[PDB]
Amino acid sequence: RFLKVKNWETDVVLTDTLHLKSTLETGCTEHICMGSIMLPTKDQLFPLAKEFLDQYYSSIKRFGSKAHMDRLEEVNKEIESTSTYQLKDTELIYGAKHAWRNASRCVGRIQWSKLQVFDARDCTTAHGMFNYICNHVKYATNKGNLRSAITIFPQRTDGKHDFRVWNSQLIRYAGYKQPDGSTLGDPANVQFTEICIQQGWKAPRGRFDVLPLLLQANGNDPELFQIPPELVLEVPIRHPKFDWFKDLGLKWYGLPAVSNMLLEIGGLEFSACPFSGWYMGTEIGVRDYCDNSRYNILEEVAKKMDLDMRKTSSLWKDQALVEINIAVLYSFQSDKVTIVDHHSATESFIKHMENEYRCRGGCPADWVWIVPPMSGSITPVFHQEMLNYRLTPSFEYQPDPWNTHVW
Amino acid sequence: RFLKVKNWETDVVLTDTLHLKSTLETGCTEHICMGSIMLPVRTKDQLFPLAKEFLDQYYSSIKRFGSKAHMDRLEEVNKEIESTSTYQLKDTELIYGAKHAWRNASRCVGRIQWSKLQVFDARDCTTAHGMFNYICNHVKYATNKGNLRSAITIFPQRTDGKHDFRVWNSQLIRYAGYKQPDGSTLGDPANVQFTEICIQQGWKAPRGRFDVLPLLLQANGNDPELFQIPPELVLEVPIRHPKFDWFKDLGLKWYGLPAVSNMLLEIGGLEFSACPFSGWYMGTEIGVRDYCDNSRYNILEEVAKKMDLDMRKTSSLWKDQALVEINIAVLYSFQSDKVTIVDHHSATESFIKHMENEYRCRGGCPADWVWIVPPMSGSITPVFHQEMLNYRLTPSFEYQPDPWNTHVWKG
Ligand code: HEM
Ligand code: HEM
Ligand SMILES: N=C(Nc1cccc(CCc2cccc(NC(=N)c3cccs3)c2)c1)c1cccs1
Numbered sequence: 084r085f086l087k088v089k090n091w092e093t094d095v096v097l098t099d100t101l102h103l104k105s106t107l108e109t110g111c112t113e114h115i116c117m118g119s120i121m122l123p124t125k126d127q128l129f130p131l132a133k134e135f136l137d138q139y140y141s142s143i144k145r146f147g148s149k150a151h152m153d154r155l156e157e158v159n160k161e162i163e164s165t166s167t168y169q170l171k172d173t174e175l176i177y178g179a180k181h182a183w184r185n186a187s188r189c190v191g192r193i194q195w196s197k198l199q200v201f202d203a204r205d206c207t208t209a210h211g212m213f214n215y216i217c218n219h220v221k222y223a224t225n226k227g228n229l230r231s232a233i234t235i236f237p238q239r240t241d242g243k244h245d246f247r248v249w250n251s252q253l254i255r256y257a258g259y260k261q262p263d264g265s266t267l268g269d270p271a272n273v274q275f276t277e278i279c280i281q282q283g284w285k286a287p288r289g290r291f292d293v294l295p296l297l298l299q300a301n302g303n304d305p306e307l308f309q310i311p312p313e314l315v316l317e318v319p320i321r322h323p324k325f326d327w328f329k330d331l332g333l334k335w336y337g338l339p340a341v342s343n344m345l346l347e348i349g350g351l352e353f354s355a356c357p358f359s360g361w362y363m364g365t366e367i368g369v370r371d372y373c374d375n376s377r378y379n380i381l382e383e384v385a386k387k388m389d390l391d392m393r394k395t396s397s398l399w400k401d402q403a404l405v406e407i408n409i410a411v412l413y414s415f416q417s418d419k420v421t422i423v424d425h426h427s428a429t430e431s432f433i434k435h436m437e438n439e440y441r442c443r444g445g446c447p448a449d450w451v452w453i454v455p456p457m458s459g460s461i462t463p464v465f466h467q468e469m470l471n472y473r474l475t476p477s478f479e480y481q482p483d484p485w486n487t488h489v490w
Numbered sequence: 491r492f493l494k495v496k497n498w499e500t501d502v503v504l505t506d507t508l509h510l511k512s513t514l515e516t517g518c519t520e521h522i523c524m525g526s527i528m529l530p531v532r533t534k535d536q537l538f539p540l541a542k543e544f545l546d547q548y549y550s551s552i553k554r555f556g557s558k559a560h561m562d563r564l565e566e567v568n569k570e571i572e573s574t575s576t577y578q579l580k581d582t583e584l585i586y587g588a589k590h591a592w593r594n595a596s597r598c599v600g601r602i603q604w605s606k607l608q609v610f611d612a613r614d615c616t617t618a619h620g621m622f623n624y625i626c627n628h629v630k631y632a633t634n635k636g637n638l639r640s641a642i643t644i645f646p647q648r649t650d651g652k653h654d655f656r657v658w659n660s661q662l663i664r665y666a667g668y669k670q671p672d673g674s675t676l677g678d679p680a681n682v683q684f685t686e687i688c689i690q691q692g693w694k695a696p697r698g699r700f701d702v703l704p705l706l707l708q709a710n711g712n713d714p715e716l717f718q719i720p721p722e723l724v725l726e727v728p729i730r731h732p733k734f735d736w737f738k739d740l741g742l743k744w745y746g747l748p749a750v751s752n753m754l755l756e757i758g759g760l761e762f763s764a765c766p767f768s769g770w771y772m773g774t775e776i777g778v779r780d781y782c783d784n785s786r787y788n789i790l791e792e793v794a795k796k797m798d799l800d801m802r803k804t805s806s807l808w809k810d811q812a813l814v815e816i817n818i819a820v821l822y823s824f825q826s827d828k829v830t831i832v833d834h835h836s837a838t839e840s841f842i843k844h845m846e847n848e849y850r851c852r853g854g855c856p857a858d859w860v861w862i863v864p865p866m867s868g869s870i871t872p873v874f875h876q877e878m879l880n881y882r883l884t885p886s887f888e889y890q891p892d893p894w895n896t897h898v899w900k901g
């Protein structure tokens with residue numbers, strides 16, 4: 084009932100009570116743990132609404148005040164009538180920040196309360212979504228000094244009128260397979276990269292071609308738009324010692340901006356809610372470059388380093404991996420674009436876990452995702468027991484829209 | 491019910507049915523995951539069922555399910571239980587049981603090797619001296635002059651819980667740790683407490699950085715006794731680096747034989763509380779954890795200074811660079827002395843193949859991602875992108891409390 088979590092490096096023991104407010108399900112059972120699986124009516128809505136409003140008013144110390152009871156009634160009225168309701172701005176801001184605060188997979192949550200929220204609930208067309216996205220991008224980029232933000236498009240009504248950003252992130256690199264049979268640019272996007280052409284895009288057939296945005300307003304077919312290059316900050320990747328590094332030709336964008344998730348506040352579903360902050364370096368250096376099914380440049384970097392690539396036990400992959408990541412961090416820092424290393428991000432997150440244990444009685448956290456993909460055991464999160472549970476408001480996955488849209 | 495796991499690097503999907511044979515609890519529920527939590531006397535009552543499940547498994551494996559031999563064994567074990575409140579395993583049953591505990595160990599990356607396990611039956615042992623002899627023969631056989639072979643030695647089972655066999659050591663071979671007055675630590679900080687107990691029981695500590703601890707052995711619920719392992723039995727490897735000649739001057743060495751001596755082996759409801767087992771090291775267990783954990787030898791700073799890395803900013807990744815070098819050194823040193831060791835790329839690759847094999851022939855492989863993924867270079871090894879199902883099958887290896895916490899001293 085009152086669960087404990089221990090840090091094995093520091094012996095620090097925290098006590099979790101916040102999980103008892105857990106609402107949704109994890110996929111795990113008494114018999115089976117699924118911690119490593121990527122994805123395991125008017126009736127429904129009022130409980131959900133009341134729950135959320137209860138935590139709102141408690142957060143502003145007006146639980147059981149007149150306004151609270153008045154609101155619960157106003158929303159109760161609005162639901163019994165319209166079959167949905169609308170959030171006040173203040174509630175929207177609290178909801179979004181809290182969906183980030185509750186993302187158990189995010190190592191970056193020490194920053195949860197400094198989130199800029201752009202209310203795009205008055206938007207009606209793809210051109211309009213495009214304007215809102217551009218302003219989001221520009222605000223967030225801030226000439227390199229990145230600022231967290233989210234833009235919230237209109238809430239789903241009856242599932243026929245959905246706003247969706249078809250891009251999985253706002254800013255990503257094109258991928259094309261060749262007759263040769265291998266891959267140019269980023270293989271993650273091959274499919275999307277073809278949809279875009281399959282709808283109209285004139286691909287500059289290249290390696291790092293920023294993809295066009297593909298936007299669907301109010302359930303309608305979606306439309307192509309190029310984000311103005313001037314708005315897409317990029318960083319040429321070079322090493323502080325290896326001059327040949329530059330000649331690998333590598334660059335990356337500074338703004339990670341997730342665009343395919345669904346935000347749930349008080350039972351209301353926001354299917355287009357792109358959000359952005361900034362990178363931890365290993366997301367680019369370990370996952371984007373070195374994954375077998377991504378840019379997969381380890382072989383190439385290893386060779387230029389003249390390492391003994393003959394036997395796994397020379398650890399040539401690991402050597403190359405570290406230099407690549409030093410390179411990415413060096414570049415971003417040199418160009419004054421915000422970025423965080425994994426040692427610093429994990430130290431931050433331990434600090435935040437501690438803050439959330441005392442101020443709030445816990446912090447849902449998913450170890451499988453919080454431990455970085457390199458140097459795990461020399462970062463402090465490795466030695467930290469964590470409890471994973473689902474609280475609301477939350478961000479959730481949702482099916483790729485091309486599997487669902489009728490034309 | 492069938493459950494699927496996918497690999498995201500290769501799109502290979504597998505189907506689990508074995509999880510249906512599971513019964514023990516995970517720690518998790520529908521509302522909470524405890525997947526990253528380190529640790530989430532029986533009556534006739536519960537013993538009968540547990541012995542029957544075990545025997546049904548045993549006789550299916552040998553293709554004799556429902557034979558007269560099966561049925562008589564059941565009847566024999568049942569009489570023995572209601573007669574004496576316990577039973578004895580046949581040799582063949584013990585062998586199968588020990589191997590399957592290994593096979594069912596969801597946190598073990600080395601399981602491709604499960605069927606080649608040498609089992610020593612030490613169930614006639616009655617004293618600590620006899621335990622010392624068995625452990626010595628285990629160590630020498632396992633070591634095999636550097637060409638390591640997996641083995642386990644199984645001492646008598648628990649009876650009333652007042653006559654337990656225990657090895658108080660956490661592993662058969664480990665270095666002492668000594669808390670110095672100035673706050674620092676000499677040798678391995680993980681072993682300070684155990685080192686104090688030993689000293690208290692009368693061990694004269696040489697008080698250097700790599701002193702092999704004595705064995706501390708309890709037979710039959712007696713107070714345990716000290717024994718020094720013969721040093722000619724303890725294979726050690728000096729740690730050098732193939733390019734950095736200053737590495738050897740750091741003074742590092744490590745032992746070759748990892749042999750865990752503090753787990754509890756559960757077979758058909760019986761509890762073997764002393765069951766030391768041994769295999770061979772994955773390099774990262776020495777190079778990442780043993781040397782570079784902050785709560786262990788923690789040589790990272792010293793190695794970084796000698797490499798003259800930029801240590802002013804973590805974003806230099808100076809910790810990450812030094813860590814790869816220390817692990818290169820460890821693998822180089824072991825290979826050069828022809829002492830079996832496996833790197834994490836090779837171990838994890840082998841495990842993915844074991845795992846697919848186990849899905850095909852067995853219907854599953856319970857696996858604990860948190861422990862299988864290596865503590866460096868996680869995502870450039872194939873297990874990182876492997877979805878895994880974790881559940882508890884028996885026979886199994888279980889944790890058990892430290893004996894200094896539970897023991898009734900006699901004096
Ligand atoms: C401010 C800097 C931020 C840093 C450095 C950061 C870092 C991270 C990292 C490293 C991951 C794992 C990502 C992966 O491997 O794909 C992650 C996941 C996540 N982050 Fe944060 N984050 C930040 C801001 C935010 C913001 C502003 C939001 C929401 C408003 C957010 C919501 C999430 C969610 C929902 C996931 C998991 C999504 C999934 O399950 O795939 N993050 N973040
Ligand atoms: C043959 C070579 C072997 C290799 C390379 C191997 C590798 C590993 C590694 C790397 C771990 C994680 C250890 C840690 O993080 O501290 C592990 C855990 C484990 N292994 Fe294996 N292993 C091997 C043989 C065996 C044998 C022979 C047994 C038993 C007969 C076994 C039973 C286990 C158990 C029970 C754990 C988990 C311990 C715990 O939960 O604390 N291993 N093994
Ligand atoms: N189920 C999947 N999920 C999936 C696939 C790719 C990426 C992601 C998550 C991307 C993500 C989400 C949130 C944060 C980050 N990284 C960041 N630093 C931020 C992005 C926005 C604010 S911070 C990346 C999730 C798939 C795997 C393979 C095909 S689909």
Ligand SMILES: N=C(Nc1cccc(CCc2cccc(NC(=N)c3cccs3)c2)c1)c1cccs1
Nearest residue numbers: 091528529600748749750767768769770771772775
């Ligand atoms: N709960 C703990 N248990 C614990 C503590 C230290 C080590 C271990 C596991 C030791 C182990 C177990 C099984 C295999 C291995 N490594 C091997 N290569 C083998 C050892 C024996 C056969 S193979 C190591 C478990 C702690 C963690 C940190 C501090 S206490």
Ligand SMILES: C[C@H](O)[C@H](O)[C@H]1CNc2nc(N)[nH]c(=O)c2N1
Nearest residue numbers: 119120121451452874875876877
């Ligand atoms: C199968 C496995 O769960 C999958 O590889 C996960 C592991 N941990 C991860 N962790 C993060 N941060 N991001 C990821 O994409 C993944 N992938």
Ligand SMILES: C[C@H](O)[C@H](O)[C@H]1CNc2nc(N)[nH]c(=O)c2N1
Nearest residue numbers: 465466467468526527528860861
């Ligand atoms: C809290 C967490 O479970 C703990 O640090 C685990 C993580 N993964 C591990 N994995 C292995 N192989 N060995 C370990 O000791 C640990 N420690």
Ligand SMILES: [Zn+2]
Nearest residue numbers: 111116518523
């Ligand atoms: Zn779980």
